[PDB]
Design brief:
The structure is a homodimer. Chain A is of the alpha/beta class. The first copy, chain A, has a single domain, classed as TIM Barrel (Alpha-Beta Barrel). Helices cover 40% and strands 16% of the residues of chain A. Chain A has helices at 16-19, 32-37, 55-68, 80-83, 93-108, 124-127, 136-152, 165-173, 185-207, 232-245, 247-255, 260-266, 272-275, 280-284, 335-347, 375-393, 436-447; strands at residues 2-3, 9-13, 73-77, 112-118, 158-163, 215-220, 225-227, 290-294, 299-303, 316-319, 353-357, 398-404, 423-426, 431-434, 449-450. An 8-stranded parallel barrel of chain A has the order 2-3-4-5-6-8-11-12. In chain A, helix 7 (136-152) runs parallel beside helix 9. Chain A starts with a strand and ends with a strand. The A-B interface holds A 5-7, 9, 72-73, 112, 157-158, 204, 207-208, 210-215, 254, 256, 285, 287, 289, 348-352, 395, 397, 399-400 and B 5-7, 9, 112, 157-158, 204, 207-208, 210-215, 254, 256, 285, 287, 289, 349-353, 396, 398, 400-401. Chain A: Its EC number is 3.2.1.21. Chain A: Keywords: Glycosidase, Hydrolase. Chain A: This is Beta-glucosidase Bg10.
Amino acid sequence: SYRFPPGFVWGAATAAYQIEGAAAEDGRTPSIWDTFSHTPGRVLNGDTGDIAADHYHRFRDDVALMSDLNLGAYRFSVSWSRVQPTGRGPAVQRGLDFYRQLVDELLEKGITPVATLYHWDLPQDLEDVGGWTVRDTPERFAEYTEIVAAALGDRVPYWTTLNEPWCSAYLGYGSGVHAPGRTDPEAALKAVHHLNLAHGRGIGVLRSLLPSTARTSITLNLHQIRPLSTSPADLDAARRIDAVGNRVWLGPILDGAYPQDVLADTGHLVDWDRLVRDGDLEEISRPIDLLGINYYTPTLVSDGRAHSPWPGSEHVAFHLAPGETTAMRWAVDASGLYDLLMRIHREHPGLPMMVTENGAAYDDYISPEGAINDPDRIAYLRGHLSAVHRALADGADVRGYFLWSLLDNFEWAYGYSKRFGAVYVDFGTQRRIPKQSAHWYAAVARDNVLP
Amino acid sequence: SYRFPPGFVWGAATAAYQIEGAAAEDGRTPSIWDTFSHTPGRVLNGDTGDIAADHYHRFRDDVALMSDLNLGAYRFSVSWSRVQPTGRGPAVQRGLDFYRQLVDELLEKGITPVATLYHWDLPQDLEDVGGWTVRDTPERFAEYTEIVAAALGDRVPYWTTLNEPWCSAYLGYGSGVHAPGRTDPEAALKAVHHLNLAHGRGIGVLRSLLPSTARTSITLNLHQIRPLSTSPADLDAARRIDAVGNRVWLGPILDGAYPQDVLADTGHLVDWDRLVRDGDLEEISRPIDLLGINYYTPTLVSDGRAHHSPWPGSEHVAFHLAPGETTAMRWAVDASGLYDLLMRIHREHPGLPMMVTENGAAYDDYISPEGAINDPDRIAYLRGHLSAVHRALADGADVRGYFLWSLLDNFEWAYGYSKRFGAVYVDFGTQRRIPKQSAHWYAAVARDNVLP
C-alpha cells in the first residue's frame, strides 16, 4: 500500500548505441563506442553495438510493448552521429526521420517522449581532433542540439542534455574503461569543464527553440558516498570523492562556481585558470527545470594511505558496501536512494527531481516452460521504490521514476553479458519476451501503487 | 540594449470581474464583489462590475488586440460563479464555453493561456455561510478546480490557484475595504489559513488532471518592506509586517510551516491550535512549479509609537510614502523594490522559478483632440521596472516571464473606473478600445525581446 503522488510519471529508459544497432546504415558515421567496441580487449568477448537489440528496425514493436506495460513516458537517447554524421555539416533527414517516427509512435500510444541529446556516442571525427578535451566540442554539441530541437521541439516535452558526464569525463579519459579509452588526469578534467560548457550552451539553444512549458534537464549519476567510519581521514575521503565525482557538476550548474576544495584537490593536475574562460560559468549555470538522478549502488570509501577515475584522490580506497549483490557485484541498498534524494532536497529545495535510471542486473534465463522468472529484480524495484515513497513523504520533490532498462542491452564494456531490462531479449533471434518483473512493473505504472 | 533571455514570456494580465461584465447573464450568480460594489459607500461613485469592459462579449476583438501587441502569453481569471453558480452543484456549460472559446481563440493566435482559478470573486452563496472564515470553502474550491481543470487541462499550460490572498484575507476580512467587507482580526487570519488550504487542495487536484508538462503556481503580492531606519523598533516593524503580510504564505507553502514569530504576534487574536488541524500543512506545502510575483510599490514602515487595520497584531506600525515619483494611486515609483523582491526569493529559494505576474501603474490618461493617448510616464515606469528585472536576471534570478497590468482599463476594485492601468485605453461609454502610446512601446518589447 504505497500510493504515489498524483501525476507521478512511470517510465523506462534506454540508450541509443545500446539498443538501436544499424551502426553504419542510412549514413550514420561511427561513434567513439563503435571504435571502442571494435578494438580488441576493450569490451568483453569483443561485443559491439553493430546489431544490439535492432531497435532501429523494430522500434514500432517496442513502442507497442511500452504501451502493454502501461508506461506513461519513455526515456531514450538520440545518436549524434546518426543525425549529424562526422559531427559537422547538415543533418541527414533519413536519420532524423527515425526519431521523428519514434516520437510520433510514442505520442500515438499516449507515451511521453524523453530525449537524451548525448549518451556517450560522440562522433569519432570529433574525438579525432581532441574530443571532450578540446573546446570546440561544446560548440559542435550546440549546433547538434539546434538540429534535434528544431525537428522535435514541438513534440518532445522533456529534454536532457547529458547522461552521466562522470563516466564520459573520468571513465572515458581518466581510467580509460569507457568512451574513447584515454588515460590522462588532465584530459579527464578538461572533459569535465567542457561537458559542463556543452550542457550550458545546450540549454541556451533549447530555450530559444522549444516551448516554454517543456522541461530541460541534465542526468547525473550522483555517487551516494558513505565513509567506512567517522574517523576524520575517512570523512575527508568521502569529501574528496564527492568533490571530484559529484560537485564538479552540481557546483557550476546549480551554484554557478566550482567548489574551492575540488579546485585544490585537482589543481596540480590541470590549470583551471586557463581552462575556465570568461563567460563559461554564466553559460553552465543557466536555470534548469529538472534534475535527473541515476542510482544503482552506494559508494563506500576509506583513507587508503597505509589508472584512476578520481584525479587527485587516488589514495582513496573503495569497498563493497554490505548487503546483497546484483550480477554486477553491486551492493543492494535502497537507503542510498533515499539519502541521495534527501540530500538534493536539503541542498536544493526548489529543484524538482526524477529518477531517470534505476535497475539491477541478474542471471536471467528462459526456463524449459518458456518463463523468465526474476523475483530478485522485483525485490530490488520494490525496495528502491519504497525509498522514493519514503523520500516523497519526507518532502522530496520526486516527479518521475524510470526503470533501466526496458530491454536487455549492450552494457558497454560488459557487452551483452549483463541484463538490466524488464523485457528479455534473445539477441540470436531479436525476440522480445516480458520477464516476471515486466508484469509487476506494469501494475505499478497502471495503478500508481506498489503491490 | 537590454537583451532578455531566450524564451522569455511576454504577456498581459486581467481579472474576471474587472473586465468581463455580464454579471447576471447565462446563469452567473452574483459574487462577493457584486454584492460589495452594489453596497452604498463601498466603491467610489457606486461603480460596479456589471458591464466593466464587456469582455465577455468582446473577447474575440481583445484577442486580436493581444496578437497586435505581439503578446506571447495572456493571464486571465476564471469567474467561480460563472462556471459553477452558487459555488456548489454542477457547472453551467454556457459559462464553461466562454473560457473554452477564449482559450481556443488564444491558441489560434499562438498566445499562451495563463488561468487564475480564484481572483477575489467568491460566490456570494459561499460567503453567506462563512466564506473564507469557514473550513468548507477550501473543499468547494477543490471541486470548482476539478471542473475547470477537466474542461481546460488539455489546453492551458499555466495554472494559478490564488491571486494575492493577502487582499482576500486582510483587505476582505481585516480592514473591510475589499471582498465581503468584514472587519475582524480573527476572521482575517482564519481566511489566511483557509486560503492556504484552498491553494494546497487545488494543487492536488491539478496534479491528478493536468499533463506533467503543465506548470502550477500561486501569485502573491509580496510586500517589499524597507524600515525607515536601523533602530530596532523599525526593524521589528519591518519584521512584523513581513511575518503577517508575506511569510504567512511563503512559510506554509514553501517551508511547510507557519513561522513562530507570526504565531506569537497574532496568537492573542486567533487560536492556531484550533485553526490548523492535522494534515493541513502537508496539503498546503505541495511542490510548486512557479511563483507569481505582483509588485507595484515598496512598503516603508516604522514603529509609529516612537516619535480597522489589515495587519492583525501590528496595528502600531506606521506606514510611509517611499521617496520617488507617484502614480495616480499616489504609489511610490521605485524599481529597486522589484529587484530586491526578486533577489530575496532567489536567495531564500534558489530553485523556485519566478514570473512577474503583475506590474503596472495608473496615470491620468486622456484622449487628445487629435485622438492620441500619450502616457510617457507609463513607458518610463515600465522601462524602469523592466531594467530591474534585467539586472536581477543578470545577477542570477530565475525570472521566466513578465506580465503587464493591465491589457485594458478595468474596474479597479474599490477605486471603480477612476484608475486606468491598461496599455489599451477603454472608453467605457462606447466600450471602444484604443491603444495608448505605451502599447506601441510594449509591443516592440514583446516582439524583439529588447528594451528600446
